[PDB]
Ligand binder design. Structure first.
Ligand SMILES: [Mg+2]
Ligand SMILES: [Mg+2]
Ligand SMILES: [Mg+2]
Ligand SMILES: [Mg+2]
Ligand SMILES: [Mg+2]
Ligand SMILES: [Mg+2]
Ligand SMILES: [Mg+2]
Ligand SMILES: [Mg+2]
Ligand SMILES: [Mg+2]
Ligand SMILES: [Mg+2]
Ligand SMILES: [Mg+2]
Ligand SMILES: [Mg+2]
Ligand SMILES: [Mg+2]
Ligand SMILES: [Mg+2]
Ligand SMILES: [Mg+2]
Ligand SMILES: [Mg+2]
Ligand SMILES: [Mg+2]
Ligand SMILES: [Mg+2]
Ligand SMILES: [Mg+2]
Ligand SMILES: [Mg+2]
Ligand SMILES: [Mg+2]
Ligand SMILES: [Mg+2]
Ligand SMILES: [Mg+2]
Ligand SMILES: [Mg+2]
Ligand SMILES: [Mg+2]
Ligand SMILES: [Mg+2]
Ligand SMILES: [Mg+2]
Ligand SMILES: [Mg+2]
Ligand SMILES: [Mg+2]
Ligand SMILES: [Mg+2]
Ligand SMILES: [Mg+2]
Ligand SMILES: [Mg+2]
Ligand SMILES: [Mg+2]
Ligand SMILES: [Mg+2]
Ligand SMILES: [Mg+2]
Ligand SMILES: [Mg+2]
Ligand SMILES: [Mg+2]
Ligand SMILES: [Mg+2]
Ligand SMILES: [Mg+2]
Ligand SMILES: [Mg+2]
Ligand SMILES: [Mg+2]
Ligand SMILES: [Mg+2]
Ligand SMILES: [Mg+2]
Ligand SMILES: [Mg+2]
Ligand SMILES: [Mg+2]
Ligand SMILES: [Mg+2]
Ligand SMILES: [Mg+2]
Ligand SMILES: [Mg+2]
Ligand SMILES: [Mg+2]
Ligand SMILES: [Mg+2]
Ligand SMILES: [Mg+2]
Ligand SMILES: [Mg+2]
Ligand SMILES: [Mg+2]
Ligand SMILES: [Mg+2]
Ligand SMILES: [Mg+2]
Ligand SMILES: [Mg+2]
Ligand SMILES: [Mg+2]
Ligand SMILES: [Mg+2]
Ligand SMILES: [Mg+2]
Ligand SMILES: [Mg+2]
Ligand SMILES: [Mg+2]
Ligand SMILES: [Mg+2]
Ligand SMILES: [Mg+2]
Ligand SMILES: [Mg+2]
Ligand SMILES: [Mg+2]
Ligand SMILES: [Mg+2]
Ligand SMILES: [Mg+2]
Ligand SMILES: [Mg+2]
Ligand SMILES: [Mg+2]
Ligand SMILES: [Mg+2]
Ligand SMILES: [Mg+2]
Ligand SMILES: [Mg+2]
Ligand SMILES: [Mg+2]
Ligand SMILES: [Mg+2]
Lengths: 193, 67, 99, 148
RNA sequence: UUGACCUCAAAUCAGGUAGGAGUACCCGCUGAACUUAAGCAUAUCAAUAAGCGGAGGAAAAGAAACCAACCGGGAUUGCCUUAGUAACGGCGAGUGAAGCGGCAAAAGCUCAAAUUUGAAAUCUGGUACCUUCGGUGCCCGAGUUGUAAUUUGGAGAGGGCAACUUUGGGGCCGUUCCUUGUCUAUGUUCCUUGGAACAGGACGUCAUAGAGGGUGAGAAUCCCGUGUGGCGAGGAGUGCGGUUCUUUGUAAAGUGCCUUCGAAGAGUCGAGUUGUUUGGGAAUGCAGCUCUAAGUGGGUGGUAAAUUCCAUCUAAAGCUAA
């Protein structure tokens, strides 16, 4: 029923929801087993570092384009600029993404530098030889971290030209709002005589 | 069961017992077409199978420390 | 094309050193392809016309292009496919008369 | 805490606090939001006015990141400078070395003018500002820099 | 007459395969009503229960005809969130996603495809000998209405030329692991009660063992175990310390320019209509009927349509662990 001054609720329990209740009692057990899987996988892939090197990419969606993060793989062009091939990079611990493209020179240079740092800090074991063991470090992500690039210094000179910069937003909003109607006005002025 | 199929790596995947009656489960091309198995926003009910999606989206997920 | 550096307007967004990546080979699937042009022209002169294509030719001759795209928009799905089919049938009309 | 409930106190008393006349039933006024226009109309208008009917225009496929524009006010605005630098930047205020505050890097989308920054020049990098935010920032001797 | 070829049959022909069970979870089809709406018909219950078909240890999905609109991400799946939100709905009751962001896990690929055309270079079977999950020889067959090699869009192929880098497998013991056997400490000392000491009191001992259980009442110390290690045994496509086939060999694979190309899936996409379904709204998906494409073009870009662009993928074929 409806009664006293209370917020109107939207609890969706008019199905047989009790047939589909998952309680995660196995949170600690699945944590134990994920750590066991990481230890077992590490022992299986001795000295290799348990994850691939990932590139640094700019996050989409203007809420999030102020941040960089780890992407999926390096860009065939980035691999070639680092000086190796994709099919060989996939064997020495580098993730390669054939479907991303570079349109940002700064992201491109950051990932070529990331790849050259990786190639300086890895020891690729000889394919058939003795290959003396090189002390497994378990994570490439914690030894080649994703750094947010510095965009400004802490202090500069005030350079105020009096543009007023709210008027800039108002005018730039107005040109977008009236670009089409006055382009059409200009062409119908051109269709005279 | 033919050895021309059981050899020749391009085709002996069909010998795996997970491929018994693909056309009864919807794993042929017309089966996945009628199941709706495609990528993107037009297929939000059907990408992982809509009964699986329905069970995921109608499950109440309770943790030990309640959220 | 080049961003302005501010957060609204016509070319809004942050100014960035641009790169122009190498052109992917897909983006070329709707291709010219000599081999396939030859196959299509041979199969065209072997198979000949379709009944709606014959109605389209005789309406281009009798009524005109606008009614021909109307009945082609009915026979095909869309108006852009109707324009493409009517411009194909105009070329067939030109080729069957010229020389 | 089962022992603190009034069920423990209604033991021995017949109706469990529900009355002998009205005599606690299953669903005496309907289930849910039933009859909000018929027998629950007074509880709708009086405590949920505006509940029934339509309001303006629909937006198909709204993404709530076209609308991410968190608002910063000038009354805070120096919290964004860390506290060890805040004292030295407001003591002996200076053009030709003014603090640069990236507001986007702290996660706001618009500067608004709530009130009274001190008279220290500041270089404020913002996606958007309001007019009075601009007026007070320039009155301090600073500048707003528009960023994207 | 005779010899093929194609199509179709027969046989207790040679070899093989399917059914049925189980069914918690999984992929599908099919599919209600009670119920809620304080009545009820749309709606809701519910794309549920029942019914039927098909799998596996996971299944399914999966390497974009994606998301986006950013300075752009980048297979799939799952969790946290998005969010009880955008949206749907007698706009009533109710219903209800997705992109982004943080994590868990992470892995990539294969065909159609090209004239081998100076080698049908390919494969099933039978038979003989062996190194018997197979190899080698020979013979019959399949197959040019196309089996191999090369190529899969990220590319790539042909030709032309400065050029260097990389050679694969097979059995033994320990070792990764699984199953399993065996050995490994210290009081049953005294007195009281009692049918019985395992109780109470006194004096001790071991403790990486005072978990547990038996034994005539509460037993670390009586017994098995427990704890800590040692010694084996029988098995699992091997990370390594040795072994050896050593003209395995102008193999095969990468990488630089230049030039010419660059084949890319049809009654399918798409459209109309009908029905169902969806949060999907002048139609989210699926299906029936009808129409039926193209090749700097097809899909998508969440308000129907014409016109002009732009952005983003590359469907109508296929595999894949967590
Ligand atoms: Mg009241
Ligand atoms: Mg813990
Ligand atoms: Mg577990
Ligand atoms: Mg791991
Ligand atoms: Mg970029
Ligand atoms: Mg499989
Ligand atoms: Mg399939
Ligand atoms: Mg189906
Ligand atoms: Mg949905
Ligand atoms: Mg499905
Ligand atoms: Mg399911
Ligand atoms: Mg949900
Ligand atoms: Mg929890
Ligand atoms: Mg929550
Ligand atoms: Mg592609
Ligand atoms: Mg003539
Ligand atoms: Mg209390
Ligand atoms: Mg009483
Ligand atoms: Mg009482
Ligand atoms: Mg009383
Ligand atoms: Mg009461
Ligand atoms: Mg009573
Ligand atoms: Mg009452
Ligand atoms: Mg009452
Ligand atoms: Mg009434
Ligand atoms: Mg309402
Ligand atoms: Mg309205
Ligand atoms: Mg509206
Ligand atoms: Mg203002
Ligand atoms: Mg027989
Ligand atoms: Mg069965
Ligand atoms: Mg089940
Ligand atoms: Mg299913
Ligand atoms: Mg019920
Ligand atoms: Mg209800
Ligand atoms: Mg009712
Ligand atoms: Mg009732
Ligand atoms: Mg009613
Ligand atoms: Mg009734
Ligand atoms: Mg339903
Ligand atoms: Mg259910
Ligand atoms: Mg059932
Ligand atoms: Mg049935
Ligand atoms: Mg089984
Ligand atoms: Mg598993
Ligand atoms: Mg599978
Ligand atoms: Mg599959
Ligand atoms: Mg594709
Ligand atoms: Mg995006
Ligand atoms: Mg892009
Ligand atoms: Mg993805
Ligand atoms: Mg979740
Ligand atoms: Mg979130
Ligand atoms: Mg929320
Ligand atoms: Mg529903
Ligand atoms: Mg994420
Ligand atoms: Mg692809
Ligand atoms: Mg005695
Ligand atoms: Mg006693
Ligand atoms: Mg005494
Ligand atoms: Mg005894
Ligand atoms: Mg005992
Ligand atoms: Mg013991
Ligand atoms: Mg013990
Ligand atoms: Mg032990
Ligand atoms: Mg090759
Ligand atoms: Mg294709
Ligand atoms: Mg066709
Ligand atoms: Mg069709
Ligand atoms: Mg149905
Ligand atoms: Mg429905
Ligand atoms: Mg529809
Ligand atoms: Mg429809
Ligand atoms: Mg639309």
């Amino acid at each position: 029923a409806i009664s006293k001054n209370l917020p109107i609720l939207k609890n969706h329990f008019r199905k047989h929801w009790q047939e589909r209740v998952k309680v995660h009692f196995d949170q600690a057990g699945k944590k134990v087993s994920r750590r066991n899987a990481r230890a077992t996988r590490a022992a299986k892939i001795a000295p290799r570092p348990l994850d691939l090197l990932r590139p640094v990419v700019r996050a989409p969606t203007v809420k999030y384009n102020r941040k960089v993060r780890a992407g999926r793989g390096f860009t065939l062009a980035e691999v070639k600029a680092a000086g190796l091939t994709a099919a060989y990079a996939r064997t020495i611990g580098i993730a390669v993404d054939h479907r991303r493209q570079n349109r940002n020179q700064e992201i491109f240079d950051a990932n070529v530098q990331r790849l050259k740092e990786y190639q300086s800090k890895i020891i690729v074991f000889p394919r058939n030889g003795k290959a003396p063991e090189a002390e497994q470090v378990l994570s490439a992500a914690a030894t080649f971290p994703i750094a947010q690039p510095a965009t400004d210094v802490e202090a500069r000179a005030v350079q105020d030209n009096g543009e007023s910069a709210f008027r800039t937003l108002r005018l730039a909003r107005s040109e977008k709002k009236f670009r089409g109607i006055r382009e059409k006005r200009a062409r119908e002025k051109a269709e005279a005589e | 069961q033919h050895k021309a199929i059981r050899r020749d790596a391009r085709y002996n995947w069909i010998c795996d017992p997970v491929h018994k009656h693909r056309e009864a489960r919807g794993l042929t091309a017309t089966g996945k077409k009628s199941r709706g198995i495609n990528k993107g926003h037009k297929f939000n009910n059907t990408k992982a199978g809509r009964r699986k999606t329905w069970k995921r989206q109608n499950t109440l997920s309770l943790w030990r420390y309640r959220k | 094309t080049v961003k302005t550096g501010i957060a609204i307007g016509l070319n809004k967004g942050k100014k960035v050193t641009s790169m122009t990546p190498a052109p992917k080979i897909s983006y070329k699937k709707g291709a010219a392809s000599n081999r396939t042009k030859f196959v299509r022209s041979l199969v065209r002169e072997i198979a000949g016309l379709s009944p709606y294509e014959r109605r389209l030719i005789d309406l281009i001759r009798n009524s005109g292009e606008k009614r021909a795209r109307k009945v082609a928009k009915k026979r095909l799905g869309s108006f852009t496919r109707a324009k493409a089919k009517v411009e194909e049938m105009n070329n067939i009309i030109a080729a069957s008369r010229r020389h | 805490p089962s022992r603190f409930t009034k069920t423990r106190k209604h033991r021995g008393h017949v109706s469990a606090g529900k009355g002998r006349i009205g005599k606690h039933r299953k669903h005496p006024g309907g289930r849910g939001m039933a009859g909000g226009q018929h027998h629950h109309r007074i509880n709708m208008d009086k405590y949920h006015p505006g509940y029934f009917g339509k309001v303006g225009m629909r937006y198909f496929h709204k993404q709530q990141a076209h609308f991410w524009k968190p608002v910063l006010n000038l009354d805070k605005l120096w919290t964004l400078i860390p506290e060890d630098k805040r004292d030295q930047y407001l003591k002996s205020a200076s053009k030709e070395t003014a603090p640069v505050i990236d507001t986007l890097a702290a996660g706001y989308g618009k500067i608004l003018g709530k009130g009274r920054i001190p008279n220290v020049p500041v270089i404020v990098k913002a996606r958007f500002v309001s007019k009075l935010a601009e007026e007070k920032i320039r009155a301090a001797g600073g500048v707003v820099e528009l960023i994207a």
